[PDB]
Every structure is written in C-alpha cells, then in structure tokens.
C-alpha cells in the first residue's frame, strides 16, 4: 500500500458558530411586526427538514447555543410598551404592548429578584430615552430603533464565559424617591411565559393597582444585542433574538392607566387586554444550518456531543423548548491521508503506452 496526504475542499462536515463570529442573517416572514431581512418562502427542500444525525465535534471559541443547559442562553418573554400621553383628569396614558420570546437576564437573589447588571464595555450609540414624547403618530405601526441602556444586563457569568447585553429591558415600577418605605421598590412584568402558549384563542386581561403611579423603564423599542467579554472579546449578535421569537406566538396588547379617588387619596390602575396573536417563522440559509436536540457542551475538553439530534433550517411555533439549538456552518477544506494500491502518478502517458504495445 501507499498512503498519501489528500486535500478535500468541500467535505460533508460542519463547524459550530462561535461568539467570535460576526453576525449572520436570520430571515422572518412577517414585515408588519418584525424588522428585516424578510423572506416568506418555505425551505427549498421541505422534505429534508428533521433528519437525524450523531454529532461529536470540538471548538476553539465558545459556541452559540440557545436553550436550558450549561453553555446555552435561556429564553424568556420580553415586553415592549408604547406610551401615549392623554389630556384627561382621570387617565394618564394609553398603551400598546408587544410580548415575545427573547433572551433571559440573570437574577439577583439578594435583592427582590432584580436583574444582574454590569457597566463594563459601554458601546457607542444613541442613549435610551428617559421621557415620553409629547406626541406619537401612527401608533398601529411599530418602529424598532437601536438603543443603549443606562446599564447592561448579564446573560451568563460562569465557566462557559461572560455574556452581557446593553439593550434595555422594560418593566413596571414605582419611583419611591421622596416617599417612605411603604412604597414598593419591586419591578413587575405585565406578561409571563404562559401568555404566549396557553389559551391562544381566548381573551387575556392584566390588571395592576397601587396607591402610587406606575412608571415604565427602561424605555426604547430595542432588541437584545448580546456579546461575549470573557475570556475573549467578540462582536454583538443582534440576530439571536430572531430565532427565539419565532418559537412562540407574539401577543399584541392595548390598554390605559387611569386614576380614581380611593380612601380620600389617589388610586392608580393599569389595564391591559389582548385577543390577538401572530405566528412567525424564522430561517437561516445555507451554508448555515441548525442542530436541535440534547446538546451537551464540555468546557474542560471543549467538546460538543449530541445523540439522535435533528438538522433544521427554520423555527416555528411548534418548537419544543425541551430541545436546544446549536448554530452550525458547512466546514472548510480538510487534509486527510488515504491509501492507494499503486504509487502516485502525474499523467496516464506511461499507462497509455502500455495498451499501445499490447495493440501492436
């Protein structure tokens, strides 16, 4: 036998997409509610979605994974609220709200379950607004604008790396400045995970009542832009939220804040109602794919293993979050030794003369 080195420029292998990569394109099929890029077509080969595969690969930089496991970012519901001032002695604002699946911040268990925050590596950009504009036209159409928050939330702070996000997160709260300790200093989330899955066809209502006015913050219709800062420094990835939002329906709310006199003192109430949901689809294009299943990441040996897992292109509202998502790409050329039964040859010219002599 003769074994030689061989170069295969297009191997049928895949590589994991890492946090040191630059952002990739994720296409959604609904321009009304989600910014671009937009594509409403089905996958080019719909019969191939969901094929099973066994995976055992390594990496150099931490892979990008979504789900509930070590090394993957957990999903949760995020709320974006538009506030319109009202000239009336009994009402303060009229509300429009959008709820969707997004990236979950970590929680401070010392405080009242507040988000873990960081001030490291503040980027350049337009600051998030602190005041409601005096006028807002075309409330039905939602305008998404990139925004920089007063502080960054922490998405991961363990041996798999440190991920932070400078996009704002919105919640209901009370000022509690210039007041006594009776003022509650806890934040309230008007929507939870159940509002996106359970009883889609029915009418949903939410009510908040307190003796103090309700404020919303941080403001800004802006989506997460996470990045890694330890042990390596990488660029922002504003496309990851697009994959999570298509895993569930998005819910559209409307409502108001009103005021009435209770116990000889002002009483403030927030009402929100919804009977409308929108289904979405989010896809990546070749040479990018998705690996879905029980992804296991081992940070000590830098190995990714997943047994009996599926290969997909698109995420829709039938996704089960028992599984996890790993972003992959078709790999570059590789070098491999292979064995032949004859020595290496450059041309068949000697070979041709063999049958010429036989033909004489």
């Amino acid at each position: 036998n003769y074994t030689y080195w061989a170069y295969v420029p297009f191997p049928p292998l895949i590589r994991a997409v890492t946090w040191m990569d630059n952002p990739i394109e994720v296409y959604v099929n609904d321009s009304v509610w989600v910014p671009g890029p937009i594509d409403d077509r089905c996958p080019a080969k719909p019969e191939e979605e969901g094929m099973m595969i066994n995976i055992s690969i390594g990496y150099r930089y931490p892979p990008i994974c979504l789900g509930r496991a070590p090394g993957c970012l957990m999903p949760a519901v995020q709320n974006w609220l538009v506030e319109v001032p009202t000239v009336s002695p009994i009402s303060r604002f009229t509300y429009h709200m959008v709820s969707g699946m997004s990236l979950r911040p970590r929680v401070n268990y010392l405080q009242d379950f507040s988000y873990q925050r960081s001030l490291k590596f503040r980027p350049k950009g337009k600051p998030c607004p602190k005041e409601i504009p005096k006028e807002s036209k075309n409330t039905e159409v939602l305008v998404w604008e990139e925004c920089v928050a007063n502080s960054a939330v922490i998405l991961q702070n363990n041996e798999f790396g440190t991920i932070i996000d400078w996009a704002p997160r919105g919640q209901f709260y009370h000022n509690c400045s210039g007041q006594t300790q009776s003022c509650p200093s806890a934040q309230v989330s008007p929507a939870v995970d159940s509002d996106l899955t359970e009883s889609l066809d029915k009418h949903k209502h939410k009510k908040l009542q307190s003796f103090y006015p309700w404020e919303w913050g941080e403001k800004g219709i802006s989506t997460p832009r996470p990045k890694i800062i330890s042990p390596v420094s990488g660029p922002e990835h504003p496309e990851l939220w697009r994959l999570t939002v298509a895993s569930h329906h998005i819910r559209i709310w409307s409502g108001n804040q009103t005021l009435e006199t209770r116990d000889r003192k002002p009483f403030y109430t927030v009402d929100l109602n919804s009977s409308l949901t929108v289904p979405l689809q989010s896809c990546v294009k070749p040479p990018y794919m998705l690996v879905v299943g029980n992804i296991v990441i081992k940070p000590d040996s830098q190995t990714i293993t997943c047994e009996n897992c599926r290969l997909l292109t698109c995420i829709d509202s039938t996704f089960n979050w028992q599984h996890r998502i790993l972003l992959v790409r078709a790999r570059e050329g590789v070098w491999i030794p292979c064995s032949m039964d004859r020595p290496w040859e450059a041309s068949p010219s000697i070979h041709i003369l063999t049958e010429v002599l036989k033909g004489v």
């Binding site: 003769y2 074994t3 030689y4 080195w5 061989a6 170069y7 295969v8 420029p9 297009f10 191997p11 049928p12 292998l13 895949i14 990569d21 630059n22 952002p23 394109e25 296409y27 671009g36 890029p37 937009i38 594509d39 080019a44 080969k45 191939e48 979605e49 094929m51 595969i53 066994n54 995976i55 055992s56 390594g58 990496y59 150099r60 660029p235 070749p286 040479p287 794919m289 830098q302 290969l311 997909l312 292109t313 078709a330 570059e332 050329g333 590789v334 070098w335 491999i336 030794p337 292979c338 064995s339 290496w344 040859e345 450059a346 041309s347 068949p348 000697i350 003369l353 063999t354 002599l357």
Partner: protein, 155 residues
Amino acid sequence: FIFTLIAVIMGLIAVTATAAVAGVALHSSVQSCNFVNDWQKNSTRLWNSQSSIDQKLANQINDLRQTVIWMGDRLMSLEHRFQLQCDWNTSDFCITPQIYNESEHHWDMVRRHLQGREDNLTLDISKLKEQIFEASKAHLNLVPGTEAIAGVADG
C-alpha cells in the same frame, strides 16, 4: 455567497446527514482513497451545481463583515489549490505525492483536525503545507521514475 437551490438532487441537510455514518470510520483510522471518494462525492456535487446568487436575499444584507471574511477564506483556498499537484486518476479532490509518515503525525493529530480542533495536540496545517510545497515540485514528480520507464520500454 448565498444561493437558493430548489432543483438540486440533494440539499445541504441531506448531504451532511447521509455522510455521518461513513464519517465514523474516517475518524478512527486510515481508509482507502476509494472510501474517501465515496464519502465526499455528494458534497462536491452540491457545491459545483449552484447557478446564481439569490438577489432577493443578498440585497438585504446590512453588515458585510461575515460575508467578506467567508469570501476571503474561499479565495485563499482556491489560490492554494491552483498550486497543488494531484494524481491524474482522481479529480473530485487532490491527492498529493507526499507520503504519510505516521511517526511525525500520529493518528490522534489527524482525528483532532477532522473534529475542528486547533489545540497543541492537533495537526499543524501550516507546517504540513510547507513540507508538501517543497516535495511536490514539477521537476521532481512530472517525469516518471526509472523503474516505470524501464518497465514499459521492454521492446
């Protein structure tokens, strides 16, 4: 750098999932060049049969960094391919005249390279390319050796 292939026989998902069975054997030991040829056959066919860039998707790209880095790797790979010397009987992929030593490159280095690792126990691609470049020159390989010229010149 982005295409929509509707009429191809096999998509990227089928090509990747079908070859995984044979990839187990490739990760364990040296196989024949015929075995490697069958493993990569459908992947090479897919990447030689795309027609034009999908203009509907390409004109919507906002950040070009990831596209440009991908194109730079492809351009570098094509430059090195133009310089390699390959066996005449195989055209899907290039078999070089560099003999595999197995004392300098233990098989564990090859397996780590196939898995996508770049640690200090992995095969050094840059060092390997320098050896192949110096050993594959035309004045050393284009002319068949004496044992081949004499064998055919029997009369």
